[PDB]
Subunit: 236 residues, 6 copies
Amino acid sequence: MRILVVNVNTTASITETIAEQARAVASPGTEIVGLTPYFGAESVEGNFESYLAAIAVMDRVMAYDQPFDAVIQAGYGEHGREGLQELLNVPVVDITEAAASTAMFLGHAYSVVTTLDRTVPLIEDRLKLAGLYQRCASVRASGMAVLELEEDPVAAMEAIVRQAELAIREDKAEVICLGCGGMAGLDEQIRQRTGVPVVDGVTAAVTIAESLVRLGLSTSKIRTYATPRPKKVIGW
Amino acid sequence: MRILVVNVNTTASITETIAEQARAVASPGTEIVGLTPYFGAESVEGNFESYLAAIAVMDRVMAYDQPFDAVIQAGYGEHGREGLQELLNVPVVDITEAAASTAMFLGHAYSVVTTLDRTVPLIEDRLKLAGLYQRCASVRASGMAVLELEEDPVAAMEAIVRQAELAIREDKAEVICLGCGGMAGLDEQIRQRTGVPVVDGVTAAVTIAESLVRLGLSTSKIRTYATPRPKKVIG
Amino acid sequence: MRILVVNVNTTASITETIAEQARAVASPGTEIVGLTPYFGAESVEGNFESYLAAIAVMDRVMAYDQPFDAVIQAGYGEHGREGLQELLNVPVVDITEAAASTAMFLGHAYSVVTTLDRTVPLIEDRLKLAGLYQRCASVRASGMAVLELEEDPVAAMEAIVRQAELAIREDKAEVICLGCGGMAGLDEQIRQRTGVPVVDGVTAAVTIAESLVRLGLSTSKIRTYATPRPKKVIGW
Amino acid sequence: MRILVVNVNTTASITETIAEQARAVASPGTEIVGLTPYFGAESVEGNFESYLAAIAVMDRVMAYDQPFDAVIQAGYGEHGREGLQELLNVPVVDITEAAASTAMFLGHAYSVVTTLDRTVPLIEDRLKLAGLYQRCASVRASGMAVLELEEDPVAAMEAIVRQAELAIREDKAEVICLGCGGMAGLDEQIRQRTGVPVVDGVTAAVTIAESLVRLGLSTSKIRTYATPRPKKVIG
Amino acid sequence: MRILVVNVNTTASITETIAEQARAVASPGTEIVGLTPYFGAESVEGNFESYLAAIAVMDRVMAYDQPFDAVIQAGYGEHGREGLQELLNVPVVDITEAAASTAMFLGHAYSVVTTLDRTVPLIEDRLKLAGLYQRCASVRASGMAVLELEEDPVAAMEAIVRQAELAIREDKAEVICLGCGGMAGLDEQIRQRTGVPVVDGVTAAVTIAESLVRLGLSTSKIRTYATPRPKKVIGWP
Amino acid sequence: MRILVVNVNTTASITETIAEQARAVASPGTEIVGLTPYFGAESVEGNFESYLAAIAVMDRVMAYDQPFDAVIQAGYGEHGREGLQELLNVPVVDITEAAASTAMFLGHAYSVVTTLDRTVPLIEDRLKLAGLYQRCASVRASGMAVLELEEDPVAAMEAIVRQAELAIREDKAEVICLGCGGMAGLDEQIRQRTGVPVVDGVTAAVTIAESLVRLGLSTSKIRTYATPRPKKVIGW
């Protein structure tokens, strides 16, 4: 099977990081194709950029010329999944929902640790809309921008771990979800330092996307995610 | 003051219909400027088109070189308000939230009557995110597409009143909200036929937008709707 | 048009203050008539006084000889709106709901800052009943009394700003609603020190009532707020 | 102990009926005093009458000059309990919350069957505020006003069981609460025809009021229901 | 009337304490019978023990051969009530819901003070399922195990009082509910120490059970709590 | 890896059906061990039987004594998951939550179609407890007993489709979850008649359990599901 794993931002090095983690857990016979959208912001940190990323991501998937069996939207708390679900007749899985959904199998409550504080209400809203927020103890921000993470992995890790500790201690989190695609692969280390399961939405999503394909399941086309009615659309 | 009233779809004839209704309730000294986005679908009926509209609407407002004091997004159940709210330092009001919010002053419960059934969950989700869904009795689809409103208006009108009637009888709605920008101006005849107040989000939005400007109020820039962080954003 | 703005307490100087604030934002040709109930408490601080204020307001409005196009009920967290809505065939707007409703257009979440801790649950209940509580980050009390706002305001002034600050920093409010009828006109310092919009229910209510009249909208008489069935009622 | 059972309306015959119902389950040593307010509507059917009844009830209880150990507010879905709770240093129980609370011990979901449709949202609002609506399957109206019950007891009773049947079948109620103070004593026919427990808020309230006294429990005065602060108050 | 008051754990001394308290408020003509399950944990502090207690309690009640008019399950935040409700044609009241329900008549919000932190989400879940969580300001753990209540009672009482004080001050609780069966009878001291009403689920439950019997009310057998359907069941009773 | 798949009822023939269905989707290298509890009801249809099964299942997994990497509890709307999670240091996935969780990736809302009307509130409660109920359009009963499914598979199929059709049309479900462990393998027919994805919790659970093992994730032992505290406990 082939899974498109799409970065929500335009920074190809992040796509590479995401794609490696995805390939790390991918089952034998699963090809991971990491895609970087052709336009949008270099990091997605707010409503405008998130909405921009939605179309950029959709555009990027439509431009893809090879057959594929599922699509992973590798952004945390970003828009666009619903657009993909309409356009596509293969399963679409967002790492946000993948992380929360799998975390929920592991503990009474989960917390998300994300980058900037301004992204938390976006993440909170996505989880609520997804019907995954009931078991969310909290969404906490490390206070470090996405692009800042690879420059001082020690400082980045320290910032993430402190929020995880608070989530666990004050919010009663029992599982931590990585709340950014660029955090991919950091889970084991955070786990080592927090003592709770830590879910990387990227690897979580690969397993879910694979499972859906294996189970012969795809997006329901019956209502909300039916193919768009053919009509005049300018651009696109 | 100047209020930009932006159609979410690319059908210019709908923009005029909306602006005309907006101009009709606008206070003296308030200029209504109706804008049609440069790209997107001729009618927005679903998630892909809605996300496309979101950017189209943001693009259209950003391209507007003249000063303005508030922005109205004239689409029901569409995305994008939050983007404009970040980009702008003026109030932005979406007709969806405008209609529901003023309807809540008028009755114990309101219902929205929209066009297509597939847009019903989009409207439901928007009202929920806006925290205006609790007093919503239902969101109902008339079963007629936006463009059918102008092509077969007698049947469309009847399809709408029928949903309103069911909303009142079965869902216990006490007020009806028009659930489409292209329904602008239809409120009065539905009112006559149902015997309940009918709210037009377009005109509701005009009053709310004016009110915000009059009160010296604008979007909070403190957190969620802070100015976007300066960075590389390509094409 | 003429709008009745009805104080919920029997302190006439407060009625005057509220009406003056109401007049400041009113459209040309909008006459504001400030009414003081004929009976009730000088300040409404709790359930009993609130229930008493509810009838006092209804009585006061019914006693009103002159034509009017809307009624504003000017207390934060008081009972009675529903009573007026049944009695009247003109729109009724309570400043509590006006404030939260306009605040919701301005930010992801709003908080109400009031006087006494004991009125906090009253406001919460009014907001819940009005279906405006989902985006309320918190209702907070400074702990200083209604009548104290005009008698000892500076320490009070600071106490309110602090609660606004905490609502923003801790509760993640992005908009502040003033929480005392006598708080009309206080937005300036909070706005500047918090950097968030501050909503005055009195002036908000004026704009909404005017708007409803301009929109040709009035209370639905179909069910909940239908005219009371004519029947025997003692002392009315 | 002495418990006031206060009618919410001014119909003295209903007060005696209610008081009678209370006396039938009252434990030995429990005195029931039925009180009719000095003002208000002969039947409470909506917000205005309800708000009026709240003070009427409060006035009536304050006017009572003999010692008492608890107060029952005997109306379904009217206001005022919180007022009594501030004014009194004895437990206050409203038959509405009394009915719903005890019903919740008996089944997975309960329904309340009331008189008029327009009182339905009032009962709903009271249960929600009381934090008892989660397990409420529905509040249903028979379609007969409070006073019509004592005009045509057969058709009203039929209308009521019908609503109880529908609450069970469609809404998945497993227990029925009577939704009018004046419905007190009517549980039996519904039970036989439905096979479900039927809760009478009046008799329920008696047991709860009694229990609270027996448990040495009274209204918390720490915050919301603290004694009103002394101040100038007219009439 | 006869009311069974069933400990969820197997510590008979706790059954006795619970039973004394039940007897202290029981009306004339009400006989209290305290039962200890034939198996289970000596104290119930978690999901496994709670599920174990559910079956144990059901087993113990079904094994009871003399007549009874109601049953009280005297454990805070444990499973099993619904099972009893199917099995029995008499009212069943769990002290958890009894405490929350009566506290709700007394104040705008109530808080529960329990034993261990790990039991807190269990109580939160039971109150939510019962539809009684809306007026709950918080569920707080004293940090003392159930058995520590009787063996280190000075420290236990103080730890409970501290949580109650925090619940009032920080969570805006107006009423305190005891959040353990082994806390039975401790309300009066906490009330005196806090200045708010304190509800003992055990004594609350007694009055509720008596009330249900007096009102001629029992579990609805129409749907969820219908008699179990007869079928092959292995290793029962 | 080895995954225990445990029937909640004592009908060994159902265990085989479930294990066979599980083996059909299991990845290479995954062994399925189907287990029947030593005690409990032949079909679990209500609270008492559910509570009895919770312990029966725990008992069965205890005493298994060969090594295993995950456990699937194969009943819809039954209790016990939390007990296993405490007792075990491997992932536990209940087919109820497995079905709903995977269905949520596929449509705006899902409905579960179960057997008896009396099990409906149990399933509802389990989904609520799991924080998976927000996107549940409805839980509907086909009207057939658990054992009635294998007497009479044609009528059962018709009864199930009928509920699925109503769920889709009236409740606006976009995907159907099988609501009985003994319904495993019936999805294709429902899918063919409805045109929406049908999720089988048994096969869904296998993919999730495997996924959790692949991801190196297990139950958080930090709080709610910590190892039970050492104390005096009498067997059963």
